[PDB]
């Protein structure tokens with residue numbers, strides 16, 4: 618909502634670098650992950666067991682509707698966490 622965005626911003630800067638998402642991107646993606654009912658809180662990102670219903674949906678709306686405005690953010694925020702929960 619304001620802090621979590623920074624907790625993941627500094628994280629993706631070590632697992633992605635300059636390619637990492639911005640503060641304005643994640644912030645927008647979050648609001649969408651809360652409106653779609655896919656998430657109840659911004660801390661839900663700490664649940665690697667919910668990335669399934671959150672990855673298929675985003676990839677479903679993008680492939681269908683024809684827009685991955687939120688996917689580009691999810692994939693990035695995920696590519697980092699996925700590595701943080703592997704070590």
Ligand SMILES: O=P(O)(O)O[C@@H]1[C@H](O)[C@H](O)[C@@H](OP(=O)(O)O)[C@H](OP(=O)(O)O)[C@H]1O
Pocket residue numbers: 626627630638639640641
């Ligand atoms: O310090 P970090 O961990 O590198 O995170 C950056 C920080 O939040 C900056 O204030 C922000 O500039 P804005 O508040 O103007 O968005 C930038 O977005 P940006 O890369 O699009 O400039 C973020 O990436």
